[PDB]
Amino acid sequence: VSHQAGDHWLIRGPLEYVPSAKVEVVEERQAIPLDENEGIYVQDVKTGK
Amino acid sequence: TVGAYLPAVFEEVLDLVDAVILTEKTALHLRARRNFRDFRGVSRRTGEEWLVTVQDTEAHVPDVHEEVLGVVPITTLGPHNYCVILDPVGPDGKNQLGQKRVVKGEKSFFLQPGEQLEQGIQDVYVLSEQQGLLLRALQPLEEEDEEVSHQAGDHWLIRGPLEYVPSAKVEVVEERQAIPLDENEGIYVQDVKTGKVRAVIGSTYMLTQDEVLWEKELPPGVEELLNKGQ
Amino acid sequence: TVGAYLPAVFEEVLDLVDAVILTEKTALHLRARRNFRDFRGVSRRTGEEWLVTVQDTEAHVPDVHEEVLGVVPITTLGPHNYCVILDPVGPDGKNQLGQ
């Protein structure tokens, strides 16, 4: 896979990661657990939706 | 010559001069006190200045014709760095007085005599999708960027996932950022070139080069009735 | 030469230099005071720098041409460790400045 300068992407799951010299770790991210009745509101910042 | 030197009767001994040992992080800056051909046979004129570097010799004993002006540390640029060189040396080996050269990237070099950096060593702009720069042309740009031309005093916007290093002919006017808006939300924008005001509604928006945010005034009772009905 | 050394009339004795004993956890950092060919025959330029390690010799007597800068401890990475090296040495044996 290829990425342009300034692009953000997410890596997830059971894995080992060593940041390449060309990559900055922006933040640690964690999944939110939700039962069939529970939810969250999320904003897609690229489209604002 | 190594060993004990015994001077001839008319040779006055003055002092011992030790070598300046060069390293790939340093260079020696010299000036000619008179005309001569140097350590590598290059003809030097009076008051001429140059650098000696490891590619010439690993140690130099400064000649009786050479004034040592000092040791010059290497300017190192990281992959994400740039710098602007004032009075840069040209192809005829002379300082290009009043001009600038912009240097980018994984590069290390010594500033030649009379060169200096405009603002030291600087960071490349890395812009995300939500970011842009407003740029001003100080002089005409012809094919400088991506097969587009700009007149002096033009403004334009660059946006999105890119690296940017401003050409010597370009001023960064401002850092500019997109405004996120859901399908019912909006902003008023005035296109200053035509003067027209419009509502931008329902998507994340980046103000193009001509535009400003426009403030809508309401009659003095209405602004309260929007809060009371909120 | 091992044993008692008797100096010739013109040889001024200065001092005894003991060997730096190397271990697989250490290396000796040296600089050349002048040009020479070293303990393994490698040509050294003035102000050049290098490391001596157990793979070269188990003990090293620093030559009169070699300035001892110090002992370098080994950098060990566990299976779960990583590190970033600044100005790393390239294929031509020179530091890649800024990389």
Tab-separated table of C-alpha atoms in Angstrom:
chain	number	residue	atom	x	y	z
A	1	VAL	CA	0.000	0.000	0.000
A	2	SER	CA	1.130	3.630	-0.716
A	3	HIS	CA	0.498	6.939	1.137
A	4	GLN	CA	1.036	10.573	0.061
A	5	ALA	CA	2.857	13.070	2.316
A	6	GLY	CA	0.457	14.340	5.035
A	7	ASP	CA	-1.925	11.313	4.686
A	8	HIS	CA	-3.379	9.733	7.850
A	9	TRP	CA	-4.268	6.023	8.159
A	10	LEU	CA	-5.279	3.654	10.941
A	11	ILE	CA	-3.606	0.326	11.811
A	12	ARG	CA	-5.597	-2.103	13.998
A	13	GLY	CA	-5.677	-5.596	15.435
A	14	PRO	CA	-3.300	-8.226	16.792
A	15	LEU	CA	0.056	-6.878	15.503
A	16	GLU	CA	3.599	-5.656	16.236
A	17	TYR	CA	4.438	-2.164	14.930
A	18	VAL	CA	7.736	-0.272	14.589
A	19	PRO	CA	7.234	3.205	13.075
A	20	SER	CA	9.226	3.621	9.836
A	21	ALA	CA	11.515	6.723	9.825
A	22	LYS	CA	9.015	8.350	7.360
A	23	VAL	CA	6.031	7.847	9.795
A	24	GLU	CA	4.851	9.773	12.865
A	25	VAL	CA	2.589	8.039	15.419
A	26	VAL	CA	-0.228	10.612	15.896
A	27	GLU	CA	-2.214	8.945	18.700
A	28	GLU	CA	-3.057	5.678	20.449
A	29	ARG	CA	-6.683	4.724	19.557
A	30	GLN	CA	-9.038	2.244	21.240
A	31	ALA	CA	-12.332	0.594	20.254
A	32	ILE	CA	-15.579	1.578	22.077
A	33	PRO	CA	-17.751	-1.440	23.216
A	34	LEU	CA	-21.516	-1.049	22.477
A	35	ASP	CA	-24.455	-3.522	23.004
A	36	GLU	CA	-27.218	-3.835	20.259
A	37	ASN	CA	-29.159	-0.828	21.737
A	38	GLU	CA	-26.157	1.489	22.413
A	39	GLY	CA	-24.361	3.855	20.062
A	40	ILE	CA	-22.215	6.939	19.503
A	41	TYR	CA	-22.389	9.894	17.111
A	42	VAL	CA	-19.376	10.139	14.772
A	43	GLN	CA	-18.449	12.941	12.371
A	44	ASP	CA	-16.583	12.039	9.153
A	45	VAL	CA	-14.357	15.200	9.026
A	46	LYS	CA	-13.449	14.674	5.316
A	47	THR	CA	-17.133	15.228	4.300
A	48	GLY	CA	-18.509	16.722	7.575
A	49	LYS	CA	-21.374	14.115	7.708
B	1	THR	CA	60.336	18.122	7.561
B	2	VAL	CA	59.824	15.833	10.607
B	3	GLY	CA	62.579	15.748	13.294
B	4	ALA	CA	64.797	18.461	14.789
B	5	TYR	CA	65.300	21.408	12.392
B	6	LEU	CA	68.533	23.398	12.811
B	7	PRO	CA	68.129	26.905	11.259
B	8	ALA	CA	70.724	28.360	8.869
B	9	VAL	CA	72.495	31.474	10.256
B	10	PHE	CA	70.202	34.049	8.573
B	11	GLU	CA	66.924	32.093	9.201
B	12	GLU	CA	65.172	33.626	12.248
B	13	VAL	CA	62.933	30.999	13.937
B	14	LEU	CA	59.502	32.422	14.881
B	15	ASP	CA	57.080	29.650	15.999
B	16	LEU	CA	55.641	26.176	15.334
B	17	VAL	CA	52.302	26.033	13.454
B	18	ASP	CA	50.241	22.856	14.018
B	19	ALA	CA	47.850	21.491	11.366
B	20	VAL	CA	44.077	22.118	11.435
B	21	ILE	CA	42.648	18.559	11.308
B	22	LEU	CA	39.528	18.478	9.088
B	23	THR	CA	36.487	16.201	9.641
B	24	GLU	CA	33.459	15.650	7.367
B	25	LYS	CA	31.447	17.896	9.779
B	26	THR	CA	33.941	20.841	9.324
B	27	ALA	CA	35.809	23.005	6.782
B	28	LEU	CA	38.557	25.644	7.103
B	29	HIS	CA	37.848	29.215	5.885
B	30	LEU	CA	40.925	30.990	4.470
B	31	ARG	CA	41.889	34.379	2.961
B	32	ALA	CA	44.902	35.155	0.734
B	33	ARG	CA	47.346	37.797	2.196
B	34	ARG	CA	49.080	38.043	-1.275
B	35	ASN	CA	48.995	36.268	-4.681
B	36	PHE	CA	50.239	32.573	-4.743
B	37	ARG	CA	49.431	29.023	-6.040
B	38	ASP	CA	48.002	27.027	-3.119
B	39	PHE	CA	48.413	23.531	-1.556
B	40	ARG	CA	46.630	22.001	-4.670
B	41	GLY	CA	48.172	24.472	-7.190
B	42	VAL	CA	45.058	26.743	-7.487
B	43	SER	CA	46.035	30.384	-8.198
B	44	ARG	CA	44.863	32.689	-5.345
B	45	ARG	CA	44.509	36.486	-5.705
B	46	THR	CA	44.982	38.944	-2.809
B	47	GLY	CA	41.891	39.128	-0.522
B	48	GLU	CA	40.303	36.031	-2.201
B	49	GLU	CA	38.453	33.644	0.195
B	50	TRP	CA	37.706	29.880	0.009
B	51	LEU	CA	37.090	26.682	2.019
B	52	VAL	CA	39.430	23.708	2.568
B	53	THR	CA	37.444	20.453	3.178
B	54	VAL	CA	38.210	16.721	3.863
B	55	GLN	CA	37.908	15.983	0.097
B	56	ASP	CA	41.076	18.169	-0.366
B	57	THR	CA	43.148	16.947	2.666
B	58	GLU	CA	42.473	15.374	6.102
B	59	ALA	CA	44.775	17.976	7.742
B	60	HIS	CA	46.040	21.398	6.576
B	61	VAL	CA	48.955	23.520	7.857
B	62	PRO	CA	47.846	27.097	7.009
B	63	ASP	CA	50.461	28.672	4.700
B	64	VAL	CA	52.303	31.966	5.510
B	65	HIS	CA	50.186	33.513	2.707
B	66	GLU	CA	46.857	32.281	4.231
B	67	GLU	CA	44.906	34.038	6.983
B	68	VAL	CA	42.755	31.544	8.933
B	69	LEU	CA	39.313	33.162	9.343
B	70	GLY	CA	37.925	30.155	11.271
B	71	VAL	CA	36.357	26.690	11.056
B	72	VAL	CA	32.962	26.366	9.312
B	73	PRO	CA	30.573	23.655	10.622
B	74	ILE	CA	28.514	21.737	8.029
B	75	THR	CA	24.892	22.818	7.389
B	76	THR	CA	22.844	19.583	7.518
B	77	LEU	CA	19.266	19.439	6.257
B	78	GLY	CA	17.006	16.558	7.358
B	79	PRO	CA	14.527	15.018	4.843
B	80	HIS	CA	11.852	17.383	6.258
B	81	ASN	CA	14.094	20.537	6.257
B	82	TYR	CA	14.850	23.382	3.845
B	83	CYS	CA	16.895	26.598	4.038
B	84	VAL	CA	17.264	29.820	1.994
B	85	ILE	CA	20.832	30.911	1.116
B	86	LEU	CA	21.441	34.684	0.735
B	87	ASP	CA	24.095	35.857	-1.804
B	88	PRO	CA	24.591	32.241	-3.101
B	89	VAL	CA	27.750	31.328	-5.111
B	90	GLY	CA	27.152	31.116	-8.897
B	91	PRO	CA	28.653	29.032	-11.767
B	92	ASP	CA	31.527	31.559	-12.261
B	93	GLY	CA	32.527	31.033	-8.567
B	94	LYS	CA	31.271	34.485	-7.358
B	95	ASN	CA	28.571	35.489	-4.834
B	96	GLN	CA	25.272	36.375	-6.596
B	97	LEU	CA	24.696	39.523	-4.510
B	98	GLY	CA	21.082	40.248	-3.424
B	99	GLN	CA	19.746	36.945	-4.876
B	100	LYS	CA	18.448	33.872	-2.957
B	101	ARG	CA	18.678	30.081	-3.518
B	102	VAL	CA	16.273	27.641	-1.814
B	103	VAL	CA	17.802	24.274	-0.815
B	104	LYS	CA	15.678	21.225	0.243
B	105	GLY	CA	15.959	17.690	1.543
B	106	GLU	CA	18.584	15.117	2.602
B	107	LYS	CA	21.500	17.500	1.840
B	108	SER	CA	24.621	18.586	3.736
B	109	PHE	CA	26.930	21.372	2.532
B	110	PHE	CA	29.201	24.209	3.736
B	111	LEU	CA	28.242	27.871	3.326
B	112	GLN	CA	30.868	29.332	0.965
B	113	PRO	CA	32.512	32.693	1.949
B	114	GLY	CA	29.849	35.442	1.791
B	115	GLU	CA	26.832	33.039	1.800
B	116	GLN	CA	24.485	33.047	4.847
B	117	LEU	CA	21.059	31.555	5.777
B	118	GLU	CA	17.939	33.801	5.722
B	119	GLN	CA	16.102	32.273	8.755
B	120	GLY	CA	18.469	29.425	9.712
B	121	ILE	CA	17.215	25.887	8.955
B	122	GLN	CA	13.450	25.556	8.378
B	123	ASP	CA	10.679	22.920	8.276
B	124	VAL	CA	8.995	21.778	5.021
B	125	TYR	CA	5.219	22.391	5.175
B	126	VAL	CA	3.508	18.981	5.328
B	127	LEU	CA	-0.209	19.642	4.732
B	128	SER	CA	-3.124	17.241	5.438
B	129	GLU	CA	-6.480	17.099	3.519
B	130	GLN	CA	-7.930	19.689	5.968
B	131	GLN	CA	-5.042	22.187	5.398
B	132	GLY	CA	-3.893	24.640	2.754
B	133	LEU	CA	-1.605	27.638	2.296
B	134	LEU	CA	-2.517	30.979	0.786
B	135	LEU	CA	0.489	31.953	-1.379
B	136	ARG	CA	1.425	35.326	-2.978
B	137	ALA	CA	3.664	35.746	-6.040
B	138	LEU	CA	6.351	38.421	-5.466
B	139	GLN	CA	7.476	38.097	-9.147
B	140	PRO	CA	5.994	36.250	-12.208
B	141	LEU	CA	5.941	32.432	-11.920
B	142	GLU	CA	6.123	30.521	-15.233
B	143	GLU	CA	5.850	26.660	-15.052
B	144	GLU	CA	7.398	26.820	-11.483
B	145	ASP	CA	4.909	24.461	-9.745
B	146	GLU	CA	2.794	21.974	-11.804
B	147	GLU	CA	2.535	23.512	-15.341
B	148	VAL	CA	0.629	26.673	-14.156
B	149	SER	CA	1.645	30.402	-14.290
B	150	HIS	CA	0.989	33.334	-11.892
B	151	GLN	CA	1.439	37.126	-12.296
B	152	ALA	CA	3.152	39.255	-9.633
B	153	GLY	CA	0.647	40.143	-6.871
B	154	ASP	CA	-1.581	37.095	-7.635
B	155	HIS	CA	-2.809	34.982	-4.717
B	156	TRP	CA	-3.605	31.264	-4.976
B	157	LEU	CA	-4.434	28.412	-2.607
B	158	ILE	CA	-2.609	25.081	-2.394
B	159	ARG	CA	-4.438	22.324	-0.467
B	160	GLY	CA	-4.270	18.759	0.623
B	161	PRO	CA	-1.804	15.885	1.150
B	162	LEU	CA	1.518	17.420	-0.009
B	163	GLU	CA	4.973	18.685	0.954
B	164	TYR	CA	5.571	22.383	0.174
B	165	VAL	CA	8.775	24.466	0.153
B	166	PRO	CA	8.140	28.085	-0.942
B	167	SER	CA	10.013	29.115	-4.113
B	168	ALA	CA	12.149	32.281	-3.617
B	169	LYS	CA	9.501	34.172	-5.698
B	170	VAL	CA	6.639	33.168	-3.275
B	171	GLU	CA	5.438	34.566	0.068
B	172	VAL	CA	3.268	32.422	2.385
B	173	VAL	CA	0.363	34.794	3.236
B	174	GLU	CA	-1.427	32.539	5.756
B	175	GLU	CA	-2.004	28.987	6.931
B	176	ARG	CA	-5.621	28.083	5.970
B	177	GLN	CA	-7.860	25.283	7.265
B	178	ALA	CA	-11.120	23.613	6.194
B	179	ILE	CA	-14.342	24.131	8.224
B	180	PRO	CA	-16.343	20.880	8.877
B	181	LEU	CA	-20.137	21.218	8.343
B	182	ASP	CA	-22.901	18.512	8.554
B	183	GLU	CA	-25.639	18.425	5.801
B	184	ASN	CA	-27.802	21.121	7.565
B	185	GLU	CA	-24.916	23.371	8.770
B	186	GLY	CA	-23.368	26.229	6.754
B	187	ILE	CA	-21.300	29.437	6.607
B	188	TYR	CA	-21.666	32.718	4.717
B	189	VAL	CA	-18.715	33.522	2.428
B	190	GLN	CA	-17.999	36.700	0.462
B	191	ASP	CA	-16.069	36.276	-2.789
B	192	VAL	CA	-14.095	39.556	-2.540
B	193	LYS	CA	-13.246	39.671	-6.288
B	194	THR	CA	-16.921	39.867	-7.400
B	195	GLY	CA	-18.190	41.067	-3.977
B	196	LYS	CA	-21.003	38.430	-3.884
B	197	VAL	CA	-22.085	36.800	-0.591
B	198	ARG	CA	-23.529	33.238	-0.557
B	199	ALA	CA	-24.381	30.492	1.927
B	200	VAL	CA	-22.132	27.405	1.758
B	201	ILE	CA	-24.178	24.558	3.253
B	202	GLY	CA	-23.808	20.886	3.982
B	203	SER	CA	-20.147	19.740	3.450
B	204	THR	CA	-16.644	20.390	4.877
B	205	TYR	CA	-15.415	23.558	3.094
B	206	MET	CA	-12.060	25.258	2.335
B	207	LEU	CA	-12.247	29.022	1.599
B	208	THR	CA	-10.710	29.562	-1.881
B	209	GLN	CA	-8.151	32.391	-2.366
B	210	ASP	CA	-10.749	35.117	-3.134
B	211	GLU	CA	-13.015	34.425	-0.123
B	212	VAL	CA	-13.606	35.648	3.451
B	213	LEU	CA	-16.172	34.602	6.094
B	214	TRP	CA	-19.097	37.104	6.150
B	215	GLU	CA	-20.947	38.181	9.331
B	216	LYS	CA	-24.788	38.242	9.096
B	217	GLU	CA	-26.358	40.985	11.229
B	218	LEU	CA	-29.896	40.349	12.593
B	219	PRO	CA	-32.459	42.966	13.809
B	220	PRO	CA	-32.026	43.543	17.583
B	221	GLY	CA	-35.060	41.423	18.628
B	222	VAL	CA	-34.430	38.413	16.292
B	223	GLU	CA	-31.142	37.218	17.837
B	224	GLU	CA	-32.901	36.754	21.225
B	225	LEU	CA	-35.906	34.913	19.698
B	226	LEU	CA	-33.520	32.359	18.129
B	227	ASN	CA	-32.003	31.702	21.629
B	228	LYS	CA	-35.456	31.594	23.375
B	229	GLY	CA	-36.691	29.097	20.718
B	230	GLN	CA	-33.400	27.052	20.848
C	1	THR	CA	58.864	-7.817	23.980
C	2	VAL	CA	58.092	-9.511	27.352
C	3	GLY	CA	60.743	-9.378	30.133
C	4	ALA	CA	63.116	-6.625	31.288
C	5	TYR	CA	63.775	-4.044	28.533
C	6	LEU	CA	67.099	-2.176	28.599
C	7	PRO	CA	66.829	1.113	26.617
C	8	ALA	CA	69.547	2.135	24.133
C	9	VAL	CA	71.528	5.326	25.036
C	10	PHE	CA	69.332	7.636	22.895
C	11	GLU	CA	65.942	5.970	23.712
C	12	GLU	CA	64.239	8.077	26.428
C	13	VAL	CA	61.856	5.869	28.478
C	14	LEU	CA	58.452	7.498	29.165
C	15	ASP	CA	55.912	5.022	30.669
C	16	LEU	CA	54.273	1.562	30.492
C	17	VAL	CA	51.028	1.315	28.451
C	18	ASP	CA	48.710	-1.568	29.469
C	19	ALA	CA	46.407	-3.295	26.949
C	20	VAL	CA	42.639	-2.559	26.922
C	21	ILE	CA	40.994	-5.999	27.399
C	22	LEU	CA	37.947	-6.277	25.095
C	23	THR	CA	34.767	-8.322	25.795
C	24	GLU	CA	31.784	-9.137	23.545
C	25	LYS	CA	29.868	-6.402	25.498
C	26	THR	CA	32.511	-3.641	24.774
C	27	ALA	CA	34.525	-1.935	21.996
C	28	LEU	CA	37.385	0.619	21.991
C	29	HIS	CA	36.853	3.983	20.226
C	30	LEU	CA	40.027	5.350	18.591
C	31	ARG	CA	41.129	8.412	16.571
C	32	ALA	CA	44.240	8.670	14.360
C	33	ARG	CA	46.760	11.393	15.511
C	34	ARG	CA	48.533	11.114	12.064
C	35	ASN	CA	48.459	8.817	8.982
C	36	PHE	CA	49.564	5.115	9.500
C	37	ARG	CA	48.587	1.458	8.767
C	38	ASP	CA	46.987	-0.011	11.896
C	39	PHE	CA	47.224	-3.230	13.968
C	40	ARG	CA	45.347	-5.169	11.136
C	41	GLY	CA	47.098	-3.268	8.280
C	42	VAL	CA	44.136	-0.904	7.534
C	43	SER	CA	45.276	2.551	6.321
C	44	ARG	CA	44.193	5.326	8.751
C	45	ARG	CA	44.004	9.024	7.762
C	46	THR	CA	44.586	11.862	10.265
C	47	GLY	CA	41.459	12.554	12.395
C	48	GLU	CA	39.725	9.330	11.197
C	49	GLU	CA	37.723	7.420	13.887
C	50	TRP	CA	36.826	3.707	14.281
C	51	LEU	CA	36.006	0.929	16.794
C	52	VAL	CA	38.171	-2.068	17.840
C	53	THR	CA	36.042	-5.125	18.890
C	54	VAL	CA	36.639	-8.765	20.094
C	55	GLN	CA	36.308	-9.955	16.455
C	56	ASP	CA	39.575	-7.976	15.756
C	57	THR	CA	41.568	-8.895	18.952
C	58	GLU	CA	40.795	-9.897	22.585
C	59	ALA	CA	43.222	-7.221	23.917
C	60	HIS	CA	44.603	-4.041	22.266
C	61	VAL	CA	47.607	-1.867	23.222
C	62	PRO	CA	46.727	1.633	21.887
C	63	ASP	CA	49.463	2.674	19.434
C	64	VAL	CA	51.371	6.015	19.781
C	65	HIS	CA	49.386	7.158	16.701
C	66	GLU	CA	45.985	6.266	18.301
C	67	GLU	CA	44.081	8.594	20.652
C	68	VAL	CA	41.815	6.606	23.029
C	69	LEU	CA	38.408	8.323	23.106
C	70	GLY	CA	36.785	5.732	25.415
C	71	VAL	CA	35.067	2.345	25.681
C	72	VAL	CA	31.729	1.855	23.870
C	73	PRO	CA	29.223	-0.514	25.570
C	74	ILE	CA	27.139	-2.745	23.254
C	75	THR	CA	23.571	-1.571	22.423
C	76	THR	CA	21.333	-4.650	22.917
C	77	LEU	CA	17.768	-4.858	21.618
C	78	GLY	CA	15.375	-7.462	23.076
C	79	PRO	CA	12.802	-9.225	20.810
C	80	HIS	CA	10.287	-6.488	21.821
C	81	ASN	CA	12.713	-3.497	21.458
C	82	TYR	CA	13.642	-1.164	18.589
C	83	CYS	CA	15.831	1.955	18.255
C	84	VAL	CA	16.398	4.830	15.785
C	85	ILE	CA	20.027	5.638	14.870
C	86	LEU	CA	20.862	9.237	13.843
C	87	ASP	CA	23.631	9.920	11.245
C	88	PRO	CA	23.991	6.124	10.519
C	89	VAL	CA	27.083	4.727	8.697
C	90	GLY	CA	26.557	4.114	4.945
C	91	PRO	CA	27.917	1.487	2.482
C	92	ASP	CA	30.977	3.755	1.782
C	93	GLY	CA	31.862	3.802	5.552
C	94	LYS	CA	30.758	7.478	6.017
C	95	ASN	CA	28.027	8.884	8.322
C	96	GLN	CA	24.745	9.687	6.501
C	97	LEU	CA	24.339	13.126	8.145
C	98	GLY	CA	20.735	14.186	8.933
C	99	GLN	CA	19.297	10.733	8.020
